[PDB]
Enzyme design. Structure first.
Site, PDB file in Angstrom:
ATOM      1  N   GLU A  35      30.433  75.182  -5.512  1.00  0.00           N
ATOM      2  CA  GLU A  35      30.647  74.257  -5.066  1.00  0.00           C
ATOM      3  C   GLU A  35      32.478  73.606  -4.232  1.00  0.00           C
ATOM      4  O   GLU A  35      32.788  74.527  -3.646  1.00  0.00           O
ATOM      5  CB  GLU A  35      29.454  73.130  -4.911  1.00  0.00           C
ATOM      6  CG  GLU A  35      28.589  73.179  -4.790  1.00  0.00           C
ATOM      7  CD  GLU A  35      27.918  73.915  -2.847  1.00  0.00           C
ATOM      8  OE1 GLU A  35      28.764  73.173  -2.143  1.00  0.00           O
ATOM      9  OE2 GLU A  35      27.242  74.096  -2.587  1.00  0.00           O
ATOM     10  N   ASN A  46      32.393  73.366   8.122  1.00  0.00           N
ATOM     11  CA  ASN A  46      31.696  74.223   8.466  1.00  0.00           C
ATOM     12  C   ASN A  46      31.942  74.183   9.482  1.00  0.00           C
ATOM     13  O   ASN A  46      31.963  74.044  10.648  1.00  0.00           O
ATOM     14  CB  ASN A  46      30.730  73.464   8.187  1.00  0.00           C
ATOM     15  CG  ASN A  46      29.841  73.839   6.481  1.00  0.00           C
ATOM     16  OD1 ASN A  46      30.491  74.048   5.538  1.00  0.00           O
ATOM     17  ND2 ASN A  46      28.204  73.113   6.482  1.00  0.00           N
ATOM     18  N   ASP A  48      29.396  75.095  11.310  1.00  0.00           N
ATOM     19  CA  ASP A  48      28.489  74.014  12.835  1.00  0.00           C
ATOM     20  C   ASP A  48      30.042  72.256  13.350  1.00  0.00           C
ATOM     21  O   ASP A  48      29.461  72.155  14.394  1.00  0.00           O
ATOM     22  CB  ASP A  48      27.510  72.859  11.963  1.00  0.00           C
ATOM     23  CG  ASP A  48      27.279  72.200  11.547  1.00  0.00           C
ATOM     24  OD1 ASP A  48      28.508  72.446  10.799  1.00  0.00           O
ATOM     25  OD2 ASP A  48      26.334  72.137  10.934  1.00  0.00           O
ATOM     26  N   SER A  50      30.994  70.662  10.983  1.00  0.00           N
ATOM     27  CA  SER A  50      30.948  69.515   9.854  1.00  0.00           C
ATOM     28  C   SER A  50      31.544  69.985   8.823  1.00  0.00           C
ATOM     29  O   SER A  50      32.161  70.904   8.614  1.00  0.00           O
ATOM     30  CB  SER A  50      29.385  69.527   9.419  1.00  0.00           C
ATOM     31  OG  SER A  50      29.114  70.586   8.456  1.00  0.00           O
ATOM     32  N   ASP A  52      32.483  69.040   4.246  1.00  0.00           N
ATOM     33  CA  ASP A  52      31.867  69.188   3.233  1.00  0.00           C
ATOM     34  C   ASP A  52      32.469  68.838   2.231  1.00  0.00           C
ATOM     35  O   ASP A  52      34.158  69.246   1.892  1.00  0.00           O
ATOM     36  CB  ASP A  52      31.033  70.824   2.778  1.00  0.00           C
ATOM     37  CG  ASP A  52      29.897  71.678   2.831  1.00  0.00           C
ATOM     38  OD1 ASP A  52      29.373  70.664   3.001  1.00  0.00           O
ATOM     39  OD2 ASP A  52      29.951  72.623   3.681  1.00  0.00           O
ATOM     40  N   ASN A  59      27.550  66.846   2.706  1.00  0.00           N
ATOM     41  CA  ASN A  59      28.216  67.148   4.435  1.00  0.00           C
ATOM     42  C   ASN A  59      27.824  66.004   5.307  1.00  0.00           C
ATOM     43  O   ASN A  59      27.255  65.290   5.411  1.00  0.00           O
ATOM     44  CB  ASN A  59      27.143  68.423   4.327  1.00  0.00           C
ATOM     45  CG  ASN A  59      27.325  68.874   6.089  1.00  0.00           C
ATOM     46  OD1 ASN A  59      26.589  68.071   6.889  1.00  0.00           O
ATOM     47  ND2 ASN A  59      28.003  69.708   6.414  1.00  0.00           N
ATOM     48  N   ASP A 101      15.307  65.103  -0.907  1.00  0.00           N
ATOM     49  CA  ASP A 101      14.706  64.976   0.214  1.00  0.00           C
ATOM     50  C   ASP A 101      13.863  66.168   1.460  1.00  0.00           C
ATOM     51  O   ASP A 101      13.574  65.945   2.029  1.00  0.00           O
ATOM     52  CB  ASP A 101      16.090  65.547   0.940  1.00  0.00           C
ATOM     53  CG  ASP A 101      16.058  65.148   2.825  1.00  0.00           C
ATOM     54  OD1 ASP A 101      15.765  64.288   3.348  1.00  0.00           O
ATOM     55  OD2 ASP A 101      16.414  66.184   3.333  1.00  0.00           O
TER      56      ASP A 101
END
Ligand SMILES: [Cl-]
Ligand code: NA
Length: 129
Positions: A35, A46, A48, A50, A52, A59, A101
């Site tokens: 990561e 990201n 989208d 977003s 990280d 995120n 989750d």
């Protein structure tokens, strides 16, 4: 801060990640190499939109608020900035919630794609245990 491999292993273990939700320690250390290359400050956009953040790359859409991500849920009640510190606690409290989750460590694309299905004990080989 840039952690050492065994340094991060000891903090991850202290913070209760070794065997958290059944995921041993080479997994988490492995997730953290790929990561972030072991760097508490790493931030990556990201598509989208977003971002990280930090040593696991937590995120902003769900997990922390950075104020520029539409629909943020800030499911760790936290500012994304605080996950970039040298004190991995807030990252490891939030990572424990993510993994719990339901999809497990699959929540981390780099874990899926690069750690999963490997001998992830190389990631702690040479660490005082
Ligand atoms: Cl699982
Ligand atoms: Na959020």
């Amino acid at each position: 801060k840039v952690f050492g491999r065994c340094e991060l292993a000891a903090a991850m273990k202290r913070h209760g990640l070794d065997n958290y939700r059944g995921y041993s320690l080479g997994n988490w250390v492995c997730a953290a190499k790929f990561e972030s290359n072991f760097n508490t400050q790493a931030t990556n956009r990201n598509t989208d939109g977003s971002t990280d953040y930090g040593i696991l790359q937590i995120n902003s859409r769900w997990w922390c608020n950075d104020g520029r991500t539409p629909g943020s849920r800030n499911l760790c009640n936290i500012p994304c900035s605080a996950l970039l510190s040298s004190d991995i606690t807030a990252s490891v409290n939030c990572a424990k919630k993510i993994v719990s989750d339901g999809n497990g460590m699959n929540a981390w694309v780099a874990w899926r794609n690069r750690c999963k299905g490997t001998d992830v004990q190389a990631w702690i080989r040479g660490c005082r245990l």
